[PDB]
Prior knowledge:
lyase; 12 strands; part of a larger assembly; elimination; five-stranded mixed beta sheet; Cystathionine gamma-synthase; C-S bond cleavage; binds pyridoxal-5'-phosphate; 3 chains
Amino acid sequence: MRMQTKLIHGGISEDATTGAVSVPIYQTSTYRQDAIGYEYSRSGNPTRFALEELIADLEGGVKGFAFASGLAGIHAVFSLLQSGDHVLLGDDVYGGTFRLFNQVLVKNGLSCTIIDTSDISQIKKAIKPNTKALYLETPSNPLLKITDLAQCASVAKDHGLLTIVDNTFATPYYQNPLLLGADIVAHSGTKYLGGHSDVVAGLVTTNNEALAQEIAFFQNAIGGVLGPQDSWLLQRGIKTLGLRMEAHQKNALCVAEFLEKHPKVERVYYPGLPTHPNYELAKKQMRGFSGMLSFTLKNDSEAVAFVESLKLFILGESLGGVESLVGIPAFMTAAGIRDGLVRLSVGIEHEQDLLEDLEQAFAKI
Amino acid sequence: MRMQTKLIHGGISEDATTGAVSVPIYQTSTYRQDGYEYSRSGNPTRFALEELIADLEGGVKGFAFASGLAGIHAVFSLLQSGDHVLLGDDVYGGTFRLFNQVLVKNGLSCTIIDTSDISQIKKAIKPNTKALYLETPSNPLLKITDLAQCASVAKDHGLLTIVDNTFATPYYQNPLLLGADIVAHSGTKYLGGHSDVVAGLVTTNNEALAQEIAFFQNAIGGVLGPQDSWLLQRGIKTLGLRMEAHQKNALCVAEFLEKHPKVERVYYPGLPTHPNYELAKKQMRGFSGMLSFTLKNDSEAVAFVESLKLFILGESLGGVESLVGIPAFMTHACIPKTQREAAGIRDGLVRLSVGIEHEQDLLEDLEQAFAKI
Amino acid sequence: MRMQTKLIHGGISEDATTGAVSVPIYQTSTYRQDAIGGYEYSRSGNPTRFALEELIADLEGGVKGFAFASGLAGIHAVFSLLQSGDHVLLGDDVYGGTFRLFNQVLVKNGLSCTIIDTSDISQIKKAIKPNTKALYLETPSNPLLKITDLAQCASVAKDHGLLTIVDNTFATPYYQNPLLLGADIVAHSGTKYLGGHSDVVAGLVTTNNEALAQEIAFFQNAIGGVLGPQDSWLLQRGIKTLGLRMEAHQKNALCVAEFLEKHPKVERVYYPGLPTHPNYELAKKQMRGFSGMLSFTLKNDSEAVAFVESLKLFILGESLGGVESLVGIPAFMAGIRDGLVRLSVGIEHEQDLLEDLEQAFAKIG
Ligand SMILES: *Cc1c(COP(=O)(O)O)cnc(C)c1O
């Protein structure tokens, strides 16, 4: 089977015993045993396991892991490290990942270095003797900066390092870090994966047998596990991923090219524009660009006004749902991040209506 | 008797007492005493196979293991800590893993070298080097290594020439007759031939080396069971005919593929255009069923393989069934992409284990897959 | 013979035939022979130049010495040993003209370089290519006085097939002897501490190794960047007070470092003699003393020029290592802030030097 069939029949997609074409929702905490010696839903749940087998299946991993949130996943990953350990980080990583390091992992003995991941020499310049991991996020939030995964994972592998890739923006449908040399892939399932702005989840998967028990252990020992209801909803959502990503990309390309040719707009940030820094690299490691774009307008004070006069676009705090979201990283989630930077999550509505909502909003500034 | 007759009557192919034209399967762990004592030390079913492989490769003794890796492990168990080994850059990921993950932790060391370049091996020899591991033709780029040359150079230093002769079987290539000290096989492949047995085979020129290997077969305990021994031996009986058919099919397929507009480069030693074709012809009496080919558009390799309906998408090789894999997404997925291209392994490289089906059915399957990209 | 004595009677310090306590100046281009079959031509050999070369060999513990038209011409000749397609490691803050030598001269001749921090011994390990032939160290470093461990870098380079090349200009043969610490080639700008009198442009190069000596000789002769007899003699003359000058330089430099450090108006101070200096314990171990070279960055960065232009004793000029005090902003003439002031502390009375600084500080905010 191919990717789009896999989205539907991949992982575990059926109930063996009943023939049920969906995985049963296992609202249980405990299972009867049949001799002294599934045991507990913190360590094992058939509904979560189905979901986990599915993400492993999509990223080409040996095991999947489902978490209460994206951050519970990322946390569980970095729990593989001891105190005195050093980690290299992208300079515009998701705000919560940086906060995690700053205020949680530091207080417990880990250190970091903020580098430019598109500058492969900067990563070389920063490897300390106690460095153990490299954390990559491409495309990036909110500038959509592209990082060469294969090359980073190469630099990383010949040093004793771990390649950890937050693959949220480009989904397993568009990018597959594990097939480029990465060791661990992390997702916020809150976003594109479930796709309906109705589930908070995290997903992690890995190439490596040993890393798999390591993650397994800390998923269960720290206990940040995803519930069966959420698991089931996320898997349900994954079934339409292919269709949703195609439409996300179609709409995003239309919006990107609308903003680029627009007088009131200065810079557009989107991986699918040929004038995007590293467009060639993007095409080589991604099979598509997603729905995420930010843009900056010439008159920088008029940002709040523009965002607030949008009717169809929803002024909200997340991304990657069927509904379009609008945001200003400065006042929400310096370094390119002018305060007049508007970040659209382009959804799956009709492109004409999405273009019309942007027209009417510019026509007010 | 000639090679073809030897596959049927060589080693021990007959039960002396009963007359049975097939060696009996001794499913026994022990023997009464008043020349066998324990089946992990010696078993008449395994012994028969052992004699056969020694007899085919012109060795003094054979040793059957639970797996190809198990045999290669027994060989490398010869060396003490401090010893250093030269490995080919296109070594079986599992052989490379043995060193990287098992033997290193035990005190060995290696250096990776292109063995098709003889001066490279010379540049790499240290005072503490004791062995040279060769594999020709290679997986997946089918790159040839001058056996006689490498054996000789290695001999005139203090080195054991260890050759993995899996791909080009004892039917087409005999390393021991070209200066090699030890030959290793994955019996799992062409030797068994029916993708139904997992086995290692190891043979040697040298009585002293044989005592060493015998000791480690026994002390480490990674031996081959009597049932599989017998199964492997049964498979070997058609090795000749199967290889003839593999090669016929493979040639035909290679020739088809280079006629082909979408296909860029084809890697097969039986092609005159293959680097070292003339060398190939010197040390091999034939070529195997093993080939790869790269297509012009990388991203089209996935679709090509997916639409195949005769070739089985699989991990192994050397069976009567044709097998297809994409080394970059299967046998080599762990390795960073830019390193894979460094080693010649593009995402568009497709490896075929050409089976023994009707060549036309094999070709019609390739045509329809191209037709769909 | 001790170093203090060796500066006066070392190499050749006497005319053998006449008994002159000074080496005569051979302003000659050619010599009569009784050939066909000592001195033939002044480019190949001159008794005055040779005297100086023998002296430096003797000072650094070399087998041969080599006098050039400048510090650069020597460094040039050293790197002239290498074929095209070879690779070399460079300190991240080697001398400004040593970079400009590689950057613009030796590269286009088929040479390749990698800028590294050499005080990070693991960084040099990370940069070794199969075609790399030599490492080039410079400690203390211009103009930050960053210290590199000569003994270890030599070792790391020695177990690979590499040549250790050290620019010993700053910590002279009187304080540091790289050749005994596993270096292969040492190079000096004679223009600096060796001449001591800011009146000679010269370069000196010496080596441990017979075969390297043959090579450097060949390239000194073939390129012909040789030092003249009068300059050699003046250089030798200068070297005779080296010990005395270095002691006064250090005594003054330590006295200034401690003034600048305890000063409210100053931010950082770079001097290997300060206890609170990166690798101070390393300095003490490989060096017998700290020289007259120090730099400092002040709190008000924009008022660096006003400071320098109001100094009355220190001379605003373009060199170092002289009996008179020199000052420069190395940026106008990676650590180097456009307000870093570099001081070449002379051998004048420390009270006069400190009173020049007091009065200069007392004119800025
Ligand atoms: C939003 C986001 C997260 C956070 O996931 P939660 O579901 O908020 O835990 C993690 N990574 C990326 C890239 C995100 O965008």
